[PDB]
């Protein structure tokens, strides 16, 4: 059973202050946030990887460590003291420079066993939607839900004619529990001898999924 490794969080030092930064508000309840995102960008699994660490103080991103640079760089002046301090520490730098391997690549190998291969087939359904007398443009809905990963293609066809116009969608909707959903609607006034079809392609399927109305 493999153990996920965490990125090392560096200790900052005091020494001086900066002349009045900013607010953009005032009156509101004062708050203070130290937030750090250590991001591993896998361009192709572990073959090409970039580590990007981003530091934020309140609403401002102030410091960055890009593995392609190899050192910390201030995004705003509030982050400069940290850049200079940490960059003067060879021991800390080598440690950060090595995390693209000891953390990013190390954890990908673990996740590649169950997150990368996760596949959940979508449930596809079609149905009309208006207010009885359609009046204006009619609306046909293609519902594609409960699927993973996010990569998916949902197309409408009018008698084998892929409709590239009159499409209204919610776009890819993330449910927060590792499943997505989307509603791709087609504006069109139906006709008996005129059939509308929804084709769905997804990496969890072997063959496209189709539905007529």
């Amino acid at each position: 059973k493999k153990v996920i490794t965490a990125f090392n969080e560096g200790l900052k030092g005091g020494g001086g202050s900066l002349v009045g930064g900013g607010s953009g508000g005032g009156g509101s309840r004062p708050w203070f946030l130290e937030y750090c995102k250590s991001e591993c960008h896998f361009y192709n699994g572990t073959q090409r990887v970039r580590l990007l660490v981003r530091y934020f103080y309140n609403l401002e991103e102030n410091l960055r460590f890009d593995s392609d640079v190899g050192e910390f760089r201030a995004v705003t002046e509030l982050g400069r003291p940290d850049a200079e301090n940490w960059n003067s520490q060879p021991e800390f730098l080598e440690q950060k420079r090595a995390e693209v391997d000891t953390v990013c690549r190390h954890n990908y190998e673990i996740f590649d066993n169950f997150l990368v291969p996760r596949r959940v087939e979508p449930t596809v359904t079609v149905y009309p939607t208006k207010t009885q007398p359609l009046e204006h443009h009619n609306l046909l809905v293609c519902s594609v839900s409960d699927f993973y990963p996010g990569n998916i293609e949902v197309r409408w066809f009018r008698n084998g004619k892929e409709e590239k116009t009159g499409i209204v969608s919610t776009g890819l909707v993330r449910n927060g529990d590792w499943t997505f959903q989307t509603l791709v609607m087609l504006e069109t006034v139906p006709q008996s001898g005129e059939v509308y079809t929804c084709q769905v392609e997804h990496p969890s399927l072997t063959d496209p999924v189709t539905v007529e109305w």
């Binding site: 990125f7 969080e9 900013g22 708050w31 130290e34 937030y35 896998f42 699994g45 590649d112």
Partner: protein, 182 residues
Amino acid sequence: IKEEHTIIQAEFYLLPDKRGEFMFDFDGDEIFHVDIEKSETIWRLEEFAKFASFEAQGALANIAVDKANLDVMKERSNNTPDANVAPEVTVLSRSPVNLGEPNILICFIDKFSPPVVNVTWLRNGRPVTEGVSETVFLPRDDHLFRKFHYLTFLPSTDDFYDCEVDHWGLEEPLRKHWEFEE
């Protein structure tokens, strides 16, 4: 073939609330987070637990550094705070809604900071405290946060729901309405 992905370790410490958080994100979804007070790794999906492990103490140690660092940042900026940024709130069902078929309502709270919010689910105007759950504060591409609150429900035309959200950045609580409509 090509495997494009992003893994993010996101962590923070907030004052004056004295709240910290440590989580991992994979392509936008939470893998797990550490319950800082109990020193335990909480997987987003139970099934994840059998494929890996994470020593919760590592998160506690990192948050301890974040807390020390926050004091340094407050000192460096002369305790100059920023404005509170109110969230956008959306309510939607997890799956197509069919009368009498169990479903889940999602209250998606987005684009806000600081990472603290009060949320209440209401069914017919009354708070619901059973069959509800929530995620921790999730990272966005920018400096803001998002969060998900969930409510199990049984579709009926006699009911209507609301997700009420309060945040230091809102004038008054925000109440988003949801009701079945085939």
